[PDB]
């Protein structure tokens, strides 16, 4: 009667913050493409079909980009997916022979400063008795010479050992749903605009978060969501000067990468089993790796980010863009894939401008390195073999990865400067609107309910 | 109307126990990283007969609803019948009740279904 | 008599229907190469389960047979009660109404106990 | 009071059937190395679900305690009412009916559920 | 102590062409032959 009595309800929608154990799922089609399993899509769950998102009405639900744990489980998963890929591969553990390098067929000048090594060596052969005089073609980010002629040898030989990647495997980014175990969902923010923290007005629900590719590169982020009206801006802490600046496009800027040179795959065996794909002499013109970025489409990109940095240092202020302080080149360069090949450019012509509080192409020097440790390891160095044909790829600058200065002087200006370095952050720009809870289905309520005797 | 998984999260509790049977249909559902999924889906049935056996050890068995013999402690933040489920989300419900939860669930267990049974045995054979 | 599992498979549905506690009975049973039968074992009490919450969350829960409160549609392969029972294998049967199988799963977990308990959440008050 | 789990291991059955709620409860709580507890945890709710499923196929499902309609064969070692539940540990007990337990299995999930409930439908319809 | 239940008044049609069992078996006896060679002495140095 009046007095209440405790009923129990199971199937209350009910969740509370957790971390579980996330599974994947990558099309239909992209199973298709085989070629000896590219990439992790092996034994991946299919995509469901016809995907359900739940819009949760009245619901508002905290979310925190930078203290979420899909990204430090996928993250963990990419380094992992590294490593099995790479396991089955040709080790190159006799390539630290002495090489007698010399500069590539071209014609001066002195400022052309070789970059490209014609290296021959010695090497084993598929039996263990007579030797092998057979030559290659290295960059020089790839050698490094020791002390009759110049004797190189390879970067990596002083620092770990070396396995060459599989020529059946591609390093082509492909989408890549993460969805929750049963008990458990992903919640989704809705919102127009979010900064990643903080409460969200429209919350929904869904099992598989949207097919997320996992473009590794800094300094500019490539491939990914496009911002809803105005370019966002987030951050850990602005304050801090120590924290980096993740930034959302919201029109994509146009970028074309090409490698002009017609590059010849030699295939020396090192047998028994095991055979090294070696560089050829180049077919054609001596040129190198660019990248080219509409100056009108960057002019009003950049002059569309200042406009929203105004709102968090001040209304009139000056805000002006520099290159990298320096340190290692997978951080002072625009790291990237395409083609098979590691692109490595100079951002000193996108950072290069002076904002005040009131038509061809950009095209960048690019450098390429075929023995790369990505990452931060030590211990396993992956040798990047040689692409035949020229390269030619087309992508989307979609977000960049900024640091402010400490040289201060505050309250006038700001400096701004590319940044990198963690791959983890790379992770957030796309699961900023995704976080894991885990469903709680038992509740007790009162009600003038009693049972029988 | 079917709101969905989850559906009625931010509708009152009175309006939510009619979207019970919804969130207990999507809660089971049906070389590495293929592991990744099984360690995974063996802690999924492991979460659902958890609270099936409690479910069961107390005077449910019945999934959905299911009446019981305890008294509501006034203790437990005192509400009133019209102020709980025509003014509170569920969400909201087990943020307060969460520090008798555990104490509840110990007078549905041993309280009621070992003395209410045995007390059974004794009616049921005469 | 007791045929075994599987064994009225090619007898009348009436008569399979005797059956029933035999192929229930064999339905659970209880380095590489060895994760084969580990990986199959999980899928199996999965499958358990899955059949078992919907045995549940309709009107059901004890095993084996149950009655409901829907109505037959005679769009669903109209045949009479002798000529079913007595005419018809389950695996015949399941061939024919396999068409409206999932149509008929949603009337007995949403239509049913959904309506039917809070029904009488309203008839346990009084 | 509460001995805790296997607490009256060394009492009577009369006394043990107090504290039936208590060995429930804690009988399913909740790179290699990692895989010795995986393949153990899985042998554990495979060992649940087998006793539940023999507690489901009996005229019994909700669990602790239920009757049956099979007569005590006085073959299966004749005590007394008093002479069992006041004179005899559940241990000393499993130790003699352990040649018969097997038969008695049979006797219930058969012989009971599948002609009570066959025999309900008979009821049902009129 | 295996038992095989002959079902009566059942008949089943089977396709030894397009049975999955021999895919299987085919995919484990391949396996099993490389879980075994692992362990094993390799003769890298027999190409002398
Ligand atoms: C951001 O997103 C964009 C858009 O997705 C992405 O652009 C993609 O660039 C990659 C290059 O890195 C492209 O991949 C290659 O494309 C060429 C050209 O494709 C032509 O032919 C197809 C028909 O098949 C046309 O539809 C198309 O329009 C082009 O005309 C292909 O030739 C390449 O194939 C090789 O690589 C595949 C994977 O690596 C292999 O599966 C395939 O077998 C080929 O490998 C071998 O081919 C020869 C044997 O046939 C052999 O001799 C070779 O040596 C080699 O071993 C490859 O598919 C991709 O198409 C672009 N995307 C689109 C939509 O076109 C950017 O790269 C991305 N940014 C970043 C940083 O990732
Ligand atoms: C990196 O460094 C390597 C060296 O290790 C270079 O490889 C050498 O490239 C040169 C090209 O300049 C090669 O020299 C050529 O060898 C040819 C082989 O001769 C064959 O034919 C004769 C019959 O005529 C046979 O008897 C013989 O057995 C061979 O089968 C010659 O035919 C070439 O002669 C031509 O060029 C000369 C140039 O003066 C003309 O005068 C001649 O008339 C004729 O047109 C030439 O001599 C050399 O063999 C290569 N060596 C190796 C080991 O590969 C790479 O080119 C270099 N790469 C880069 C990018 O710098
Ligand atoms: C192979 O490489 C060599 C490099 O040593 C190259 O020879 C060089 O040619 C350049 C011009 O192409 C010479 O530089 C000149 O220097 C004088 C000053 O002494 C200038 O007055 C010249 O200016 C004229 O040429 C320019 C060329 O672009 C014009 O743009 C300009 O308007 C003037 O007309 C010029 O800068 C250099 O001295 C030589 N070096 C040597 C060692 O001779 C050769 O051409 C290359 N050959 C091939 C086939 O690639
Ligand atoms: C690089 O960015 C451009 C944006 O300028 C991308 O082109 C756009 O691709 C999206 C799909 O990712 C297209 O959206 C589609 O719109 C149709 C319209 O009805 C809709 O039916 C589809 O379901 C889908 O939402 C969009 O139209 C297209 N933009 C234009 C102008 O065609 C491009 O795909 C990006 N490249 C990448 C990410 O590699
Ligand atoms: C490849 O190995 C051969 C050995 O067959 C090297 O030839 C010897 O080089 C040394 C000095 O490096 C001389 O003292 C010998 O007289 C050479 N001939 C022999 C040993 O028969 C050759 O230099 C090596 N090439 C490299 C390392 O590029
Ligand atoms: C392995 O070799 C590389 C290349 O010689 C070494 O990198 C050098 O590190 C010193 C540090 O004092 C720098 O001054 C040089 O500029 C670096 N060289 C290049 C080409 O960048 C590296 O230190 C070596 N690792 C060892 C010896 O453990
Ligand atoms: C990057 O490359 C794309 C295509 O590779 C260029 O788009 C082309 O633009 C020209 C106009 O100059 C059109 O005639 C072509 O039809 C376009 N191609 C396609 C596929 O749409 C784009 O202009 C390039 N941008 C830069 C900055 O180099
Ligand atoms: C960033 O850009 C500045 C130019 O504004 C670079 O400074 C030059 O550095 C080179 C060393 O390679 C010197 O020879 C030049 O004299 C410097 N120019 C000036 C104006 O100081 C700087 O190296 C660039 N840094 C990076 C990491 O790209
Ligand atoms: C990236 O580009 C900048 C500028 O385009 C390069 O800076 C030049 O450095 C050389 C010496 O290496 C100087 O002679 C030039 O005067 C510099 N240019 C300017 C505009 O100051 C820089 O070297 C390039 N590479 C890297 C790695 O930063
Ligand atoms: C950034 O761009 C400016 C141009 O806006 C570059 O200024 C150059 O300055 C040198 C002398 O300081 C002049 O000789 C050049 O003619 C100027 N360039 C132009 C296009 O007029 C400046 O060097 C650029 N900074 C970097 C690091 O590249
Ligand atoms: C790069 O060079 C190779 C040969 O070294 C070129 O391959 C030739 O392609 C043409 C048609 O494109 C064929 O008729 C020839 O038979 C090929 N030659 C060989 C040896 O296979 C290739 O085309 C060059 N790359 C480009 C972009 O032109
Ligand atoms: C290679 O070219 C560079 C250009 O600066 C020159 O200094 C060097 O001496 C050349 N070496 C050889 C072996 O030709
Ligand atoms: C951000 O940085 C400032 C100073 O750098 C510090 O005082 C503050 O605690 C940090 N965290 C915030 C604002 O959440
Ligand atoms: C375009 O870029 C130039 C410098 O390259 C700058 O002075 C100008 O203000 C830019 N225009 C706009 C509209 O931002
Ligand atoms: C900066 O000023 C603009 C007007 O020029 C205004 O729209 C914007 O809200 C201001 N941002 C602040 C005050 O943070
Ligand atoms: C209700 O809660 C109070 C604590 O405020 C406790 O003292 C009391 O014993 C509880 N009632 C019962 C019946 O246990
Ligand atoms: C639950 O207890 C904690 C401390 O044990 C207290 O801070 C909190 O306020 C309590 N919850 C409510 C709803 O009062
Ligand atoms: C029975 O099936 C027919 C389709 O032939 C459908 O139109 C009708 O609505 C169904 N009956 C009910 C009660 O839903
Ligand atoms: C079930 O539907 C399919 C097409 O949806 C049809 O071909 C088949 O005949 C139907 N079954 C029966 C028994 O009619
Ligand atoms: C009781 O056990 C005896 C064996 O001593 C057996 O002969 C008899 O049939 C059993 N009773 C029943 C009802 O089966
Ligand atoms: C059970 O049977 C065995 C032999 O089958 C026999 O030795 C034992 O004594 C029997 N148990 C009892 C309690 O008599």
Known sequence: ?453 | VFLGFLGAAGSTMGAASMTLTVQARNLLSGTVWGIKQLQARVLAVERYLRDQQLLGIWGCSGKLICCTNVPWNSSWSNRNLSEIWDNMTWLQWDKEISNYTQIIYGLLEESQNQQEKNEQDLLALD
């Open chain 1, 1 to 453: 009667a009046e007095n209440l009595w405790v009923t129990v309800y199971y199937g209350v929608p009910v969740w509370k913050d957790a971390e579980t154990t996330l599974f994947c799922a990558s099309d239909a089609k992209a199973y298709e493409t085989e070629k000896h399993n590219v990439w992790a899509t092996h034994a991946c769950v299919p995509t469901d079909p016809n995907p359900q998102e739940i819009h949760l009405e009245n619901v508002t639900e905290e979310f925190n980009m930078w203290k979420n744990n899909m990204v430090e489980q996928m993250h963990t998963d990419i380094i992992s997916l590294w490593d099995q890929s790479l396991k089955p591969c040709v080790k190159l553990t006799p390539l630290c022979v002495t090489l007698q390098c010399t500069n590539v067929t071209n014609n001066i000048t002195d400022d052309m400063r070789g970059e490209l090594k014609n290296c021959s060596f010695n090497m084993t052969t598929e039996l263990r008795d007579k030797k092998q005089k057979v030559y290659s073609l290295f960059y020089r980010l790839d050698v490094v010479q020791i002390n009759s002629n110049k004797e190189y040898r390879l970067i990596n030989c002083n620092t770990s050992a070396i396995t060459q990647a599989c020529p059946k495997v591609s390093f082509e980014p492909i989408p890549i749903h993460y969805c929750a175990p049963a008990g458990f969902a992903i919640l989704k923010c809705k919102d127009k605009k979010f900064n990643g923290t903080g409460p969200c007005p429209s919350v929904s629900t869904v099992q598989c978060t949207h097919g997320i590719k996992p473009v590794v590169s800094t300094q500019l982020l490539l491939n990914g969501s496009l911002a809803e009206e105005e370019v966002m801006i987030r951050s850990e802490n602005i304050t801090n000067n120590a924290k980096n600046i993740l930034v959302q496009f919201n029109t994509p800027v146009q970028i074309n990468c090409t490698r002009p040179n017609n590059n010849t795959r030699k295939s020396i065996r090192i047998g028994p089993g095991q055979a090294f794909y070696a560089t050829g002499d180049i077919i054609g013109d001596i040129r190198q790796a660019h990248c080219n970025v509409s100056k009108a489409t960057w002019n009003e990109t950049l002059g569309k980010v200042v406009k929203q940095l105004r709102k968090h240092f001040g209304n009139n202020t000056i805000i002006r863009f520099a290159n990298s302080s320096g340190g290692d080149l997978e951080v002072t360069t625009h790291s990237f894939n395409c083609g098979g090949e590691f692109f490595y450019c100079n951002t000193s012509g996108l950072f290069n401008s002076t904002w005040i509080s009131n038509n061809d192409s950009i095209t960048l020097p690019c450098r390429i390195k075929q023995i790369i440790n990505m990452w931060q390891r030590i211990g396993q160095a992956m040798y990047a073999p040689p692409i035949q044909g020229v390269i030619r790829c087309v992508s989307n600058i979609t977000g960049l990865i900024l640091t402010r200065d400490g040289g201060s002087t505050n309250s006038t200006t700001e400096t701004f400067r590319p940044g990198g370095g963690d791959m983890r952050d790379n992770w957030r720009s796309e699961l900023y609107k995704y976080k894991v809870v885990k469903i709680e289905p038992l509740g007790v309520a009162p009600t003038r309910c009693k049972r029988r005797v």
